[model samples]
Target: GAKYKKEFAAYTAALAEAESKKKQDGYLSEPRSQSLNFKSEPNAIRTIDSSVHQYGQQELDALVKSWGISPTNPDRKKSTAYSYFNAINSNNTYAKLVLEKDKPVDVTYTGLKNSSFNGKKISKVVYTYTLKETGFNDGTKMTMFASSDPTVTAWYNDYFTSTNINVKVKFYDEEGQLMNLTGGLVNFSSLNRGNGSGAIDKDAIESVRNFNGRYIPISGSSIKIHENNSAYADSSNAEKSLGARWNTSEWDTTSSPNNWYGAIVGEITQSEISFNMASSKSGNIWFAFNSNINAIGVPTKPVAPTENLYFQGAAALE
Candidate 1:
């Protein structure tokens, strides 16, 4: 049948060039040097450093200014992924991801949808936007997981850190975007419990990009990657990618954080979006993250808008 009529004419010419690239989608308030990669890279790597406590050099210069990234080659192992996520999340927490274990919380990115991709020129509105992704496994630990998921939770399932430092912190995708960041969404939305808004920080992630304003929550893993960051900061360009939490942060050293509210997003529904890993310990060995991963995102939901685009794709433990 002529190969099903040439694969339905190449799927109708790739859906007419993706509906004219979704009305030329392009939203940014900060980062633009895009392309980090959550697609694929570490098939296998191995090193293993930190007996516990790592990420120096000003917390790797504040994780390249909280994931705007620019500094590579710190030395450790050809270093990069923000110094290999600072060498395997140093036990994994980066002193509670700087700004320091904040408490400010409030996020309202609920199923915002206002699409209109004008082909000739009639209307064009875009909304449905959601960021915040996570990738686990560097060392290892398993606090518990016989069964869970009533709604959400992750203070510590304990999955040791050590991708052997293969260099990662990548997850890129923007042009007409739809990278959604996946695997039980490890960066916020812990609705049922574990402190609402998964306990905000980093000025409650800049009040979800200045929507409410006045925030003070310091760390909580930097409120799980600022809606995928972009209000401004581009050493070379990087908005998201904590993959090789290589040295996530100072489990304890100061700068703020005590219990490391180092991961959040906590509740972004319409379809669903959640992530939590509030971090309570790294030495007592409780700050967890383990559970059969590897399934990035973008199965669908690419209308684009909600502005400030960043966390592209590839937090894939793959």
Candidate 2:
């Protein structure tokens, strides 16, 4: 609640998601079938191994222009819900599910088929989103199950728990201006300790480094309270959320995904990535274990990276 106070201020107002708004050259411009991992330990966490690519600067500028983001006055944001992160590299032990703001997920909300949830593993999950997209809906309902098949399951349990979150994404234009603003949800909160047992390798590093002209990383936490909650700027509008809970089907799979609170809900954990455009051709990209920016362009404190320090749980090797 307190954490969201600063975050909400940065995010842009929610414009209705439209089919016409999908960027043909932005994140996942080519949506393919992706494999996702799930674990039910502290909570349900979804893990999707995301990648980066070098997007055409001209195309990206057009995409931003389509959304009213001028490379000149680039900060006129549509969404500022972002958690500042460092570079994304090979040795990191975490995963981020990348998404396009205002774009519909090209997936049917169906991951629950033949599955079970005994002994605390999640069998079903229901997502209630504010914006409407193609695959994910506004009033729409979806479900997830701990599949009986191990391949569809996560390798490390409890390491990556299901953490429901909402945040924003941004990319730099050729001028290094923070433009191309978009929003996203922070999925699967990683709670693992220790360091790498295996590495994602140079390909991961190279991919992220090469993502200079292209990339919009978004990750965040729960918001059940108002940090000014805003609209305080208005007379009759005051936002209030006295609720936040993870779903629990009595620890069973038979319950409806539409309803379940598992007793109650919450969190404020986040990470980040940075792209250096100067020498981006041969420059570096990195993953900071913690976030540094409190809000867009607002640095609260310094986060020092340790030599041997790393987050837990590697991206699933499928």
Candidate 3:
């Protein structure tokens, strides 16, 4: 256990810091769903791939205003119809709208569902998609499956085997280019690496603090952590648990990366995203990745979290 002394110490510090911050700033908002009151009129914003006339600046402005987002904000502007097609695109909400081509939709993943497990492919997968919207030319419905990516998944599986956790990914789809992701687990000890294609050795669990990866662009996504362990059973406080949650998007804002150990790693990028987590026990993490921001939109059940201790799920298509 001495080998994990440093790891456990840092975990303790993170919990303390988070508790203090919560008392000072209240609590972080939990993820919730909002409707994208989209209209298909000349003065309205259409789906991501709507005709040029439907996506003019006036339309964009109207759409942004509908969502209460000031179009005049320096960081906001209209670009593509798809950008405003989902709630996650601009308001950092927990939803997306995927513009599909009217085919059987198949949502895929390249690694562990969690962004922290950088590029680990879904060796095997069984997932489900719940339809949130319908009747759009962009696509009829969405599907789920597993595939391969040489860059992240293949690269790691070639050297490592199962991590010992199980992963189940649930997708919420709307007609457009956005796909809402939810439900996943992370076996706290699975980060350790071994040489064979077998389960990780129980005695040699490694100390891993950060998880990173690239899959969907999470520029406007929200992150939530659910603790499965009984550590905080009697405590009504969300901060009383020893488990840690990370916001990869919050990393650079802190004075030093070290100060942000239990926080998100940095600002979310358009292509890939990363975050951190701290725990020696198994629990679940929920990530709501979005498409564009400023989409005129209007937008959860507290599902129990699952653990991702093994290597089996969808493949990376993006």
Clash count, one per candidate: 61, 16, 44
lDDT (Cα, tens digit) per residue for candidate 1, span 1-318: 666566556655644554444323121111111111211111111121233222355554564444333245443222233332333333231122211112212211112122111111111111111112112321221121100111111122111121110001111122333333232121211111111121221111111222111111222132322443212111111112422221223221112232122322221122222222222112112222121111111122222222111111111110
Tell me how candidate 3 scores on lDDT: 0.23
Maximum-TM-score candidate: 3
Residue 211 displacement in candidate 3 (angstroms): 23
Better of 1 and 2 by lDDT: 1
Give the candidate order by descending lDDT: 3, 1, 2
- Stretch of 10 with least lDDT, candidate 3: 153-162
For residues 1-318, write the lDDT of model 3, one tens digit per residue.
Answer: 554566456555655554444423212122112111111111111121222122333444465345333434343222221232222222221112222222222234322222211112222121222232222222232211112221111111101111111122332222222232222222121122111112322121212222332211111212212233111111111121322232222321112222222221121222222232221111111222222111111011122223111121211111
Q: What CA RMSD would candidate 3 show?
A: 21.5
Estimated TM-score for each candidate: 0.19, 0.19, 0.24
Question: What digit string (tens of lDDT, one per residue) describes model 2 on residues 1-318?
Answer: 655554344322211121222232112211111111222222223332223222233443354345332334434221210001112212223332223333222111123333221111223332211112112222132111121222222121111111111222222233333332111111211211111112211111111121112212211212111222210011101112212222112121212231111100111111121221110111121211111111111111211223111112222221
Worst 10 residues of 2 by lDDT: 230-239
Global fold similarity of model 3 (TM-score): 0.24
Backbone clash tally for model 1? 61
lDDT of each: 0.22, 0.20, 0.23
